[PDB]
Symmetry: C2
Subunit: 213 residues, 2 copies
């Protein structure tokens, strides 16, 4: 799917990426580049197939965080990503797994279009670059590096979310997950079990605690 986006490049690579082994040398952008100056950047990422429960609270988290002046960072994926990003508009930054001349995934075109229009989309890839396994992983590192705090509402084991979670730990980005029932959201519960993430037991509280930092 063609985006018909009119895109350029960032003048400067955000310093957040300096922590990376191989920081992007060039970033392509469409939308509000000033969002990159937001004091509080929060990643919300997770399963492409969230339960009604997780969706419900992903919406509250995104809306309230954006209401309090934070910007939500995600990857525009089906499920958790695109729920969080739509509900954070216009304060949201998407890192694309393809060049900005392409829309991916196709079914998210309306929201992604709105992000291009009122938020910000960034890509490491210049043109005619279709999503490929390595680019999904590559952009995942950018979501984590750019973000100050990482929220994973719901996630399975051995998922991309879990890889991103390990990146968050590597870079000491505070990691929070939604409380989840047994034998569901296995990935996030393992994070809780191993003390690698904190649970969000009260959304308004959680947010005020982030703000007071």
């Amino acid at each position: 799917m063609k985006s018909h986006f009119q895109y350029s490049t960032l003048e400067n690579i955000p310093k957040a990426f300096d922590i990376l082994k191989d920081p992007p040398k060039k970033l392509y952008c469409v939308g509000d580049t000033k969002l990159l100056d937001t004091p509080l950047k929060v990643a919300i990422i997770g399963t492409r197939r969230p339960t009604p429960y997780s969706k419900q609270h992903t919406i509250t988290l995104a809306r309230e965080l954006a209401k309090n002046g934070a910007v939500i960072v995600s990857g525009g994926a089906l499920g958790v990503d695109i729920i969080a990003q739509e509900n954070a508009l216009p304060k949201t930054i998407m890192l694309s797994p393809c060049s900005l001349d392409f829309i991916y995934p196709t079914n998210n075109h309306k929201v992604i279009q709105e992000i291009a229009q009122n938020g910000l989309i960034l890509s490491e890839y210049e043109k005619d670059f279709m999503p490929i396994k390595g680019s999904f992983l590559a952009r995942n590192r950018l979501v984590i590096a750019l973000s100050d705090v990482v929220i994973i509402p719901q996630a399975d084991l051995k998922s991309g979310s879990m890889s991103s979670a390990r990146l968050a730990q590597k870079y000491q980005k505070p990691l929070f997950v939604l409380p989840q029932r047994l034998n569901e959201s296995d990935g996030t519960n393992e994070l809780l079990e191993k003390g690698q993430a904190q649970g969000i037991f009260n959304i308004q509280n959680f947010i005020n605690t982030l703000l007071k930092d």
Copy 2:
């Protein structure tokens, strides 16, 4: 409701009770007093209105602990209590909020009879004593005192279960809970949020670990 139980008195107060600031001077009993010598005593207490979710896992916890030679201690209450006790039979000990000549709650009369027959029921009250606000809270301290570990599958804030959690902490009895969604079990989630309880993220590993010590 009269029980028509034939009951006696324990020859003396079990040692576990001597931690209490006001230990029972006498305990009345019906059933198999040999259960008091079981190495591992585990309390399973909680809301009188468990979700299907909490119910299914309470059943597994109770059965598997019994299989592993543990005795399940509870108060024979509607909901979590009686589910665990019935599934722990015959290895279960009930602490009654009333004298043993009465059945409470009446809806549990069938299982309570089975506990008197094949398990053990204890009471601090000799006779003609119906349950009262004070006797539930008194009973709770005996559940906590007798038990080595306390599992609270699901509970509301400011509840009898929470009262028991407070006693568990006071008398250095380790707490454990089931993972619960946001706004379904505020009581147990608060325990998790304050690090006052540990979550059960795998029932089989939970049990094995208990056996280790």
